[PDB]
Amino acid sequence: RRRYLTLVMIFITVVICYVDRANLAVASAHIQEEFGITKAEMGYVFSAFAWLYTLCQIPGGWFLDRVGSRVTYFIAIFGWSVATLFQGFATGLMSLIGLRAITGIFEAPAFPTNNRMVTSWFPEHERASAVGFYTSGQFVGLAFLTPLLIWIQEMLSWHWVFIVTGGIGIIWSLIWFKVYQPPRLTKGISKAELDYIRDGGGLVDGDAPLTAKDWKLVFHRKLIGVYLGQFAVASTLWFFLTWFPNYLTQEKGITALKAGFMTTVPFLAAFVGVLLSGWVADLLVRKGFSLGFARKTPIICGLLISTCIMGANYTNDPMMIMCLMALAFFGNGFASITWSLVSSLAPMRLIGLTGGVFNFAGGLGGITVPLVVGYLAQGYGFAPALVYISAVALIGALSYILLVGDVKR
Numbered sequence: 001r002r003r004y005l006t007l008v009m010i011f012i013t014v015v016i017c018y019v020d021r022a023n024l025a026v027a028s029a030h031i032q033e034e035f036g037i038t039k040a041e042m043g044y045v046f047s048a049f050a051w052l053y054t055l056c057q058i059p060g061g062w063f064l065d066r067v068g069s070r071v072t073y074f075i076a077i078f079g080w081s082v083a084t085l086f087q088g089f090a091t092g093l094m095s096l097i098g099l100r101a102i103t104g105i106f107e108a109p110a111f112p113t114n115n116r117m118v119t120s121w122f123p124e125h126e127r128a129s130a131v132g133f134y135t136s137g138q139f140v141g142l143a144f145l146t147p148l149l150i151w152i153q154e155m156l157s158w159h160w161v162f163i164v165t166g167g168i169g170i171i172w173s174l175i176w177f178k179v180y181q182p183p184r185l186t187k188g189i190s191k192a193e194l195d196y197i198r199d200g201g202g203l204v205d206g207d208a209p210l211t212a213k214d215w216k217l218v219f220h221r222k223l224i225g226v227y228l229g230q231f232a233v234a235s236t237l238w239f240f241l242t243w244f245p246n247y248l249t250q251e252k253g254i255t256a257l258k259a260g261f262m263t264t265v266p267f268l269a270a271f272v273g274v275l276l277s278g279w280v281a282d283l284l285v286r287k288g289f290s291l292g293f294a295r296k297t298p299i300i301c302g303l304l305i306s307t308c309i310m311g312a313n314y315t316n317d318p319m320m321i322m323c324l325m326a327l328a329f330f331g332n333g334f335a336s337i338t339w340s341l342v343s344s345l346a347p348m349r350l351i352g353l354t355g356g357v358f359n360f361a362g363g364l365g366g367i368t369v370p371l372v373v374g375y376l377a378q379g380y381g382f383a384p385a386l387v388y389i390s391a392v393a394l395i396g397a398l399s400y401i402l403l404v405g406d407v408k409r
């Protein structure tokens with residue numbers, strides 16, 4: 001029982017990763033207040049992380065390949081942890097963009113190293129449950145830590161939100177460097193436990209032209225719907241990781257302290273949507289259903305749900321705002337599961353490429369919505385932004401139910 005402890009350390013790093021994404025949403029109001037930047041300029045601050053994140057992913061694969069999984073993880077954690085620690089001492093605007101950008105650099109190869117690690121640390125049948133553990137759990141981490149930082153932000157200056165988050169990361173990097181090592185090079189493991197992995201699957205030792213014809217295939221009536229769909233899934237997720245705290249603070253005039261305890265229900269609602277979707281996956285086909293309709297239904301329904309974010313601007317009651325926000329985020333988590341489906345639509349050759357472009361579509365949804373909300377909220381308040389997301393969600397839903405009636409193989 002040493003195989004899981006690794007998964008526990010990966011889960012912690014996924015949380016620390018997403019805290020350093022949402023840690024800014026906490027201090028958005030104060031940073032904006034102190035530095036006196038405009039809503040639209042703040043939109044560029046939120047986005048700074050997303051730009052390089054998507055760009056520094058195909059270079060992240062290179063660095064990873066030629067540097068390894070262990071060491072590459074330490075450089076990343078330490079890299080962005082230092083970059084996050086100094087987000088607390090930033091002054092002006094340009095200082096923040098660079099730190100957010102740098103954070104996006106070292107945090108971009110986060111997942112690829114995970115997939116390369118769970119591969120060698122767990123068999124095949126335990127892999128789907130392994131990734132679902134730390135991706136589903138990430139929202140639990142944001143649910144309990146987001147009210148904490150806000151409470152720290154309301155007790156201590158917003159800087160300490162970044163000093164804490166950054167300092168912790170600097171410490172976890174050092175922990176990772178010692179404890180972690182491939183299953184083969186992991187003392188305390190069990191002789192039979194390792195054989196289970198090796199015989200079961202995974203590389204316990206470790207992991208060891210372009211024609212424009214593909215472009216025409218990669219861009220398919222079925223695959224565009226997948227891209228526009230993921231673009232919409234990422235649009236909503238990055239709103240909750242950025243503008244959602246300040247939304248309640250400014251638009252609805254909720255006290256940051258109450259808005260800090262109102263944000264732990266939506267992040268938990270996401271944790272359920274993810275799991276409840278993975279359960280409807282097995283469940284449907286189990287009752288004699290095709291696989292395409294089995295995975296399409298959670299995605300389409302969840303995005304049609306997301307349309308409920310629009311309803312929040314028609315009420316000023318916390319519980320009703322907190323209920324509607326929790327239902328939309330549930331739809332996002334319930335419709336989040338795509339790539340494994342997208343892997344079964346691209347040709348056997350382009351499974352690797354589709355990922356990069358497929359995520360780019362997602363990462364593209366995270367670059368747009370912060371600028372859109374920042375620009376919209378600057379001039380017309382936060383009301384015209386929630387209709388955009390409900391729209392996008394409706395386009396992503398229409399884009400999935402019309403453009404993907406069946407699967408290509």
Ligand SMILES: CCCCCCCCCO[C@@H]1O[C@H](CO)[C@@H](O)[C@H](O)[C@H]1O
Pocket residue numbers: 063075079098102105
């Ligand atoms: C004013 C901000 C300057 C940006 C600094 C962030 C990058 C740190 C540069 O050091 C190292 O350089 C190598 C290649 O140059 C990288 O492979 C490695 O990941 C990185 O750790």
Ligand SMILES: CCCCCCCCCO[C@@H]1O[C@H](CO)[C@@H](O)[C@H](O)[C@H]1O
Pocket residue numbers: 053054135233234237274336337338339340341362363366
């Ligand atoms: C650029 C920043 C990246 C943020 C990612 C937000 C969009 C999520 C991508 O969809 C993912 O599809 C997987 C298929 O298995 C699911 O398991 C997983 O739950 C889901 O998250």
Ligand SMILES: O=C(O)[C@H](O)[C@@H](O)[C@H](O)[C@H](O)CO
Pocket residue numbers: 111112135339355358359362363
């Ligand atoms: O699956 C996820 O959790 C992300 O959305 C991915 O799209 C990453 O951006 C990257 O592709 C890692 O594989």
